[PDB]
Amino acid sequence: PQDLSEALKEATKEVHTQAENAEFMRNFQKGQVTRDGFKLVMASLYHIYVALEEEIERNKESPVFAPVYFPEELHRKAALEQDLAFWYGPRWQEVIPYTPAMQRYVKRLHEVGRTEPELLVAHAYTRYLGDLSGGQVLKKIAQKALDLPSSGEGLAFFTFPNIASATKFKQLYESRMNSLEMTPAVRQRVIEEAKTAFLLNIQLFEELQELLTH
Template sequence: MKGANRIGSDLSEQIKEVTKDNHVRAENTQLMLNYQKGQITLPQYKILLCSLYEIYRALESELDRNSSHPAVEPIYFPQELARLEPLERDLEYFFGPQWRKQVIVPAATHKYAERLREIGKSNPNLLVAHAYTRYLGDLSGGQVLGKITQKTLGLNSNEGVAFFSFPGVTSPHRFKQLYRSRMNSIELSEEEHRKVLDEAVRAFEFNIEVFDDLQKMLSITEASGGSGNQNGQTTPLTAISGSPVIQFTLGLGVVLATVAMGVYAAF
């Protein structure tokens, strides 16, 4: 991380620098470009929501549990940033009242969630890297991706896209400035600082690897069907989980949750 030391002491700037190459790679993957063109399908979007739910359930559980930790307290903004409740509304919209019984959690999502729970228990400092890349990425790209998703899937209201809305943030630009300032105020030793930067890189790399695998499976996913209407009028994910192709594709689907939002992050 010697390069990071040359760009100043701000943790936010250092994360931006050490993940720069990863960021560019994520932005230019074919699936991300397709998403920007409005070429996401309903089955893909529902997989996204399932993955997001599991990831944020783990992240916000650990942030809540460590809210008084010296590294977490400065960047703990549950009223402004919490995504779990909006995700639950979106999932209920697409899967119906019994959505919890229909959500399938991909294997890759499990791994990411397990990592969040692991560091929440053993090294809460590292939650800073995940919270920053997730929340600021989602906040930066939320408006754009929300409108793209709404138009592509033919949604006539805000139903089904609550995840992209941050009603507690009146000015994303000012809030991101506040968030960076709070994060940069966290006191870390040189070793702790390095580990946070390493964790940010690790998160990006994990997602890019999954993203590349998902791109290879796209044509097979589309050929497997799984289409349907909203408001729960769909083939439940649980009903198709027996297919090896679908199982594998679901295992890769976390990429949309962990990269598609974050690539827009105006770090």
Template sequence: MTNVIPLSAAIRTRSQAAHSSSEGAGFMSSLLRGERTRDDYISLVAQHYFIYSALEAATERMRDEPVAARFISDKLTRLPALEADLAFLLGGGWRERIAPLPATARYVARIEQVGATWAGGFVAHHYTRYLGDLSGGLHIGRVIRRQFGFETNGIGFYLFGDIADPAAFKDVYRHELDAAPWDDAEKERVIDEVLLAYRFNTEVFEELAGERGTAIA
């Protein structure tokens, strides 16, 4: 008898290397070591703004799609927090002072493409971003707060005030992945899209490192 591997476990196993590569990208690792400036951090927040603008626009389009709707929760919404963070960090004219990097633009284009036509692809990007935010993102927020002397202003993106138990929330999310009515071929497509999402994320970090230069001494 063949053991059936749950989709959530398959994604976790197959994406482990990509996840480690993304987490270890030079820009993020140097940021978390305290080797980057406040402006470097602002550049990261700006790229998140473009990514989540696309993802949350796709979320609105997917609300009535039967499978995608299982994963959608307003408790995850990040865009208002990102807007508040950028207003705090850059001031009232922040929208005119930010622009997407080429890697971010490619990432956004892919989210827009799958978020308009393909529930599985949307879920792949939704999973990669939000479950990452509820995992390592919480730690990142604490580190950034300490480094730059923030309270809650400037790190609102990393705060999920409406989710009392992130671990339980993630368990429910993974249960929905395992229960999704996708055949084996579609599950493979979803896994491939998760890997693509990690690749896009890593490319954004690489371009941030290139744009911002080497870490401070």
């Protein structure tokens, strides 16, 4: 379609379903997730968002990203820091795993944010809008499956405090995406990059599943 947001959604339908079909994610949906599994996914998210938000700040004033810059509404790094301090303890920075699959994702994020800025929107879109609109169902499952204490912490990642209405913010963000000016060629690369984002998540899930079944 003409609208980039609508174009992205349609192009990534296949891969998104592929992501839902991933073994690790299948179990997740079937309410089957363990503490070790959830810890691994949280650590992954921490690394992914550290890299993504590092690159967003580097290109926040660029006309190729500025229109979709919503730092207060979307930042997740601080939330994950809080969360990992719960899951891995006070020395979490020293013990959280940083696997090859995580490194491949982080590496693509830095390359994009450093040499192909116009493609950063593909990752911001995939991560932010994906986690926001899907957070509810993912958290619901997690908390009833993890049976954690009334600690009052460990899942801050699933709540975007600076966003009163998810649906409302989503349409705003989409509107801003469709306001972005880019050559047909770039537009194609952004759509491709979005598919690449899903592939990076899929290989991540495959790796985490592998680490948990020994």
